[PDB]
Amino acid sequence: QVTCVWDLKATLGEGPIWHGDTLWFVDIKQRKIHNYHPATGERFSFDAPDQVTFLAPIVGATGFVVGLKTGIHRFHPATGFSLLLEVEDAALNNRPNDATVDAQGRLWFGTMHDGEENNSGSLYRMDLTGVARMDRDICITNGPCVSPDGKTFYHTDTLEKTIYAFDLAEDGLLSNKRVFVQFALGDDVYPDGSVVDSEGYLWTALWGGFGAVRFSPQGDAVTRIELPAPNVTKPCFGGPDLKTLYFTTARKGLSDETLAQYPLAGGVFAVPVDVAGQPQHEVRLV
Ligand SMILES: O[C@@H]1[C@@H](O)[C@@H](O)OC[C@H]1O
Numbered sequence: 001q002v003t004c005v006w007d008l009k010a011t012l013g014e015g016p017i018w019h020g021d022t023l024w025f026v027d028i029k030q031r032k033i034h035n036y037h038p039a040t041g042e043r044f045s046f047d048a049p050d051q052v053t054f055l056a057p058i059v060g061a062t063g064f065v066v067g068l069k070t071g072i073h074r075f076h077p078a079t080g081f082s083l084l085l086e087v088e089d090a091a092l093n094n095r096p097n098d099a100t101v102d103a104q105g106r107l108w109f110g111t112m113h114d115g116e117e118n119n120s121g122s123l124y125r126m127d128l129t130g131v132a133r134m135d136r137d138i139c140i141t142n143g144p145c146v147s148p149d150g151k152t153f154y155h156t157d158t159l160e161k162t163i164y165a166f167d168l169a170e171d172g173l174l175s176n177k178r179v180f181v182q183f184a185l186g187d188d189v190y191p192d193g194s195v196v197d198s199e200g201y202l203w204t205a206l207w208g209g210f211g212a213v214r215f216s217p218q219g220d221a222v223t224r225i226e227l228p229a230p231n232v233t234k235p236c237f238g239g240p241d242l243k244t245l246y247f248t249t250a251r252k253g254l255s256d257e258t259l260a261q262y263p264l265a266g267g268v269f270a271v272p273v274d275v276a277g278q279p280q281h282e283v284r285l286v
């Protein structure tokens, strides 16, 4: 049985990372940044001026790169949020979503239509050279991640239920886009966030799928973890050995009867696994 380590009941828990030997994540719709210490069970929360969608630590503990609906900001507990750059026109009614940091310190993050209807979202790569638009015309982007060897990049079109794979060159460009995995069975099962473990396997959390799936680098499902929560948003490897798989979940979109049957929905869950994950990388801004 899977254990819920924090009965947070978040509306849209998302973007978990393992940083400073603690778990950091967000509640997008409640505009919260949460921090959880597994060794003591202590929890901390910070209020955000708008929807906050991802966190990525910057080298030197100079804060996090975070995604607010108003743009990409820096967040530091002792200075708040300060605008780093607007990436899209506010008229699009877009907002950032998921993100990851590769082994070279680059921040890959996506945008999406906040109304979840228009194909106005894009994929961006933020590094020392600036911000480059890597893909476009995606309604809900999700789960950017790179393989441990750095040669493969994964990205998710959630509403199309598709996970694509790209060839990633050392210079940082994507090529040879192809469908990695397509979800067919499940009318209300959508792929949300994904990560890649130390062995190159893809862990994908299922929106409306009550858990997460582990895929071989060839695209075959090999393991499924089930949670007492209908909408699982993202996995994150943490713990002292990177073998404790945490999961964020969401109460958004669930009826009152479903939430009464699954009262732990929106909480943070943890499961021990056999394969360790990848260490968290930090964004290079200098
Ligand atoms: O690592 C840092 C963390 O300890 C806290 O201060 O938030 C800012 C981060 O950069």
Ligand SMILES: O[C@@H]1[C@@H](O)[C@H](O)OC[C@H]1O
Binding pocket: 012, 014, 028, 097, 098, 140, 142, 158, 192, 193, 207, 233
């Ligand atoms: O809005 C949600 C988005 O934040 C999440 O990443 O994927 C599921 C969507 O419904």
Ligand SMILES: O[C@@H]1[C@@H](O)[C@H](O)OC[C@H]1O
Binding pocket: 007, 263, 264
């Ligand atoms: O799981 C339930 C929890 O969500 C609620 O808050 O307290 C009662 C528990 O049974």
Ligand SMILES: [Fe+2]
Binding pocket: 014, 097, 098, 142, 143, 192, 193, 233, 234
């Ligand atoms: Fe997501």
